[model samples]
Target: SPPAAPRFNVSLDSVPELRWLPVLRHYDLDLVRAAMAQVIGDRVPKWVHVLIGKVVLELERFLPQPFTGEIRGMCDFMNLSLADALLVNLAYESSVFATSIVAQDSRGHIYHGRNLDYPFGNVLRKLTVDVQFLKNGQIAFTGTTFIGYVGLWTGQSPHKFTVSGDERDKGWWWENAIAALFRRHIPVSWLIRATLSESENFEAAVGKLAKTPLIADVYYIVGGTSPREGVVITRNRDGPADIWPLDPLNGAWFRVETNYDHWKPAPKEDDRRTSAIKALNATGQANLSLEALFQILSVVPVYNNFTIYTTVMSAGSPDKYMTRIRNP
Candidate 1:
């Protein structure tokens, strides 16, 4: 069996986000740059690259405080230009980051999990890293994230919650990002990181996840320690459009979030939900342990070729949280 992602511990040093990312992971940064260039090097048209670079330059100052600094730091350490760093790291929909399952076992232990998918799966597998962010001598949050990327597409705040972001596939990412800057909204990934760092309880985390304005419309599946604490927040640019919670008593025991809204059918060409639903039903609530959740998520279609990794977690049992680099 392949190993779980290698653990990388990061110290915040009382600064915001990860200004010291260069100091800790310079080698990983080099690896990321090589893979990134390989996947989309000089093949892409220069116009598109210039377009992203020019606009990013205009709105560069508006990114969350010290986060832009972190990007600069990555550039310095990786020997990359600011444009290349922002171009790749700022991507919203690329990782795909879909397929979330927030389940409550019969024992009422909620297990939050996801199969992080992306197009460049082979390369991403190499970049996959398990990260623990330390702040003031405590583990603030841990993420199964990419080496060069600062945001948390999948993360767990020990004893509090787990979160994952799935792209909603709406307007252009940079256009919305620019608008968010004017409105003082934070990026979705930044909000997830903040939730882990700041929110001490489940309800507060859900509220913040729902209410925070984001640069792009996205889906957030979060799980808390308590029963019925699992939720899938469908967010628009300004606020939440829907908040679907785990109501086991009412028969909605497990909620699966893919790239589309739960209330609607996923497009015929890309529906990953139907098979997932059947798999969950096969297991049901009686055997829905964290281990079972992993097996269910590891199936054929759910753990498809695009899946970069699978992260299984529970806010209640942080010790059992699992991050694995999946190979198919």
Candidate 2:
């Protein structure tokens, strides 16, 4: 195994920071490639590889040029195949049940938080927190992401909004590949990044997410400094989003979203949702602080051995947030 991954925070001035070049340049592409090989070893079905090939082909036709270019640059520096790099970038969609909560404190301070549940053994080698400052100067976002990844998993757009999304089933990967042949399909992660880069407020973020055609189903938790801006948006492939607003009367109103949709049947155990609701009702929002929110998130029942990181963000200030990572 590699040395324990160090936890660090970084703030950048552009979309693709020049600093990432060194990380990508010296990273053990061979180990990552080996991991990919292990996962795709002969024991797995051949159709899976075939499907990935088809998706990469489709992505070439529809993925935004800049993103593909970025992947290509990373591949060149890391000496990896474009397909391998794309697989790593797209793997975020397979994340398992995650827990997210949006709540208001007694003083009307809004907070958004989530637990990023993933196979830690696969990621423990390369975890890091990256914050990007868009040159346009409208927003800055911070989140936990891998060294070469462009996706933001749990992030805050200081003073504007905070966001974290739970992955949902979109059926088979093959279906998504076929869907992309005919229309534009953006990954939920990329959409979230764009929202941070451009959106000025909660409504604008919702507008962007609602209108984007997604490749998979996802549930997004968004909280803004304003009282009425908290929402849970459930999105499916090529469909309009289903929105659930925070209960105005539930003063410390806490809303939780796991892997399931409120309007549809859940595929996995929903103990996480129940636990979150119970905790939310038990605590007064006004009395809740960022540290307290983190405590609540830590105890939420939706995690597995792979759960590696927790993050909390305050909508009141762009610079107010906290992150915790599990060390090897």
Candidate 3:
């Protein structure tokens, strides 16, 4: 319709109508109309300019603080200033290039951000969680984007595990049936009893009182079996796993107990050593290695920040329990 947009070489003869138009009309009416259209289309309207400026102002305010924790403390850790913090935030926002969002949460308060909120909390893109600090002693962060397994694993065999379309949501647990195997080996073993009990010679040390750092009668259970002197031990219901803030100073994990399974009233250090030695000789229980015992305790799901749960599911495949357990 538009003469094929005049591709390649153009001929004056090809545009016969324009060539035939009178010179006066072309110079006056047509030229003037084109000029006016170009001027209006190319220039920004005043109201739009004002609205854009407001948007920028709001973005500057909203993009500055993403987190508030030790990550923010990193600014001081790096000796940065408040003004520099704002600059850094602005740069990050520019790089991320998010759309503006304004919404009222379940609570009747309003929130504004560079990203729009989706209905049903649907994510348009996979977002990786990252942590950063602004110079003003503020932390900036994001949670991980959901990367379906299909993206992480493709093809078959050594390079990637075989996965069905429906299994994309299953993640690593579905990959190897690790959970089924783990259940066979651990078999609801109690961490305390497994770590502590040496033998009859050890005096049921696994069932004995904690003699170091803490003084408490610690018993263990597997599904529900109370820790016995000789029976297979499993886990403790007391110290359920949970997440706690990371210790910035050490980068080590410390989780809050989902349930209270803690030491009894602590014995005085002198008394603890005395009791420990007494158990070593007269008591059937042996003093277990604290480090090893702690490692086992660390396996609790709550303390493990859902890792243990994930690992268990991955290792045991409760869905395929028959396949998981070993035959005696």
Candidate 4:
């Protein structure tokens, strides 16, 4: 039975692992070719590929060489064009993060939960990777991501912190397409990775989040081991960010972030945030258990008919406990 193939991959402790390579090599060209063919089909014009190739050339100048190198490796291995690979990597731009995150202080045991909502596509959902980068055998950063994509959408560094983002904008949009097309700017997804890899703690994460320029509007949620440290940063492409602290009254705190900005007028009805808050208020911070958190995540559905992945993590200690809906 093929020795029951491992669901994911990891690397030796000696090297700085480019985690995406293993999945790219494991699946080879079959998966990549299928996904692109499915997404593009026969309708996408040939010129679009040429245009995307030009766009990628400009975008590459701003991105780190190591990441670009990995992308090239994937393209070479899969026999894919650089333009097609960039299109795949940047598909999130057209989609919504449509995510929900809840964090609270449960008697000093910090509980964090998130649900990643996206259009129904099992190719990405099935191949989601739990990537861990190590330094001297110690876990440096870990992200819940997909193959051929280097950005960190949701990640946690044990004993350090956890970071996630929710897309607030509705419909297809770009914050500043011109600046993104020509100038040096970091994508929000990449910023999330930078925060996880570079930030020592919550304070440092906030600093990084504030100074970085973004390509879109996103709400970045961060949680750490301390009761004093959970925040939702509302970021914009044109202006400075606004920071909101999680409710920290009487040692019981609960914070929720959804697809719309609460700081501004409601753009759309987000039942997810409403129900999530109701559940948190009912459960209370100190009373939240893993089962209860999971139940809360299951309450809201966005983009598609189901929640693709739900994760619950605790930052109380160096050895964090992480629970996922579909993990091998």
Best candidate, lDDT: 1
Q: Once superposed on the true structure, which residue ranges of model 1 sit more than 4 Å away at CA?
A: 14-30, 38-48, 55-57, 92-97
* Span of ten consecutive residues with least summed lDDT in model 2: 1-10
Runs with alpha carbons beyond 4 Å of true place in candidate 3: 1-72, 95-328
Query: lDDT of all the models against the reference?
Result: 0.78, 0.67, 0.20, 0.64
Clashes of each: 0, 5, 30, 0
lDDT of 3 by residue, 230-318 (tens): 11111222222221221324421111111122122323431222322232233211322222222222322212211111001010111
TM-score per candidate, chains pooled: 0.91, 0.85, 0.14, 0.84
Residue 262 local lDDT, model 2: 69
- What is the lDDT, from 0 to 100, of the residue 186 in candidate 4? 66
Residue 9 in model 3: shift from native, Å? 63
Alpha-carbon lDDT of model 3: 0.20
Q: Which stretches of candidate 2 lie over 4 Å from their true place?
A: 1-19, 25-31, 36-45, 51-58, 119-121, 134-139, 250-252, 263-270
How big is the positional error of residue 82 in model 3, measured in Å on the Cα after superposition? Answer: 1.6
Candidate 4: where is the Cα deviation over 4 Å? 1-19, 40-49, 120-122, 170-175, 238-240, 250-252, 264-269, 302-304, 318-328
Candidate 4, residues 1-328, lDDT tens digits: the string is: 0011123444424222343555567664676688766655432346555666677777667766445666676777677877776666666544544554546655655667777766545466555666676666667777777677767678787787888887757433433533554565666777888887788887898778766877777888887877667878888864446887766675437667876776664444545666777777877766777667777776644223545566666655534434354322
TM-score-best of 1 and 4: 1
Question: lDDT by residue for model 1 over 1-328, one digit each (tens)?
Answer: 6578878777787454345564345455556777656544532346657765677676676677656777777777678777777666666334475799999888888988888888653477777778788878778888877766677888998988899888887756666665676577877787888888889889899999999888788999999988899999999988899999999888888999998988888888887788788989999889888778888888878888788888889988887778888883
Better of 1 and 3 by TM-score: 1
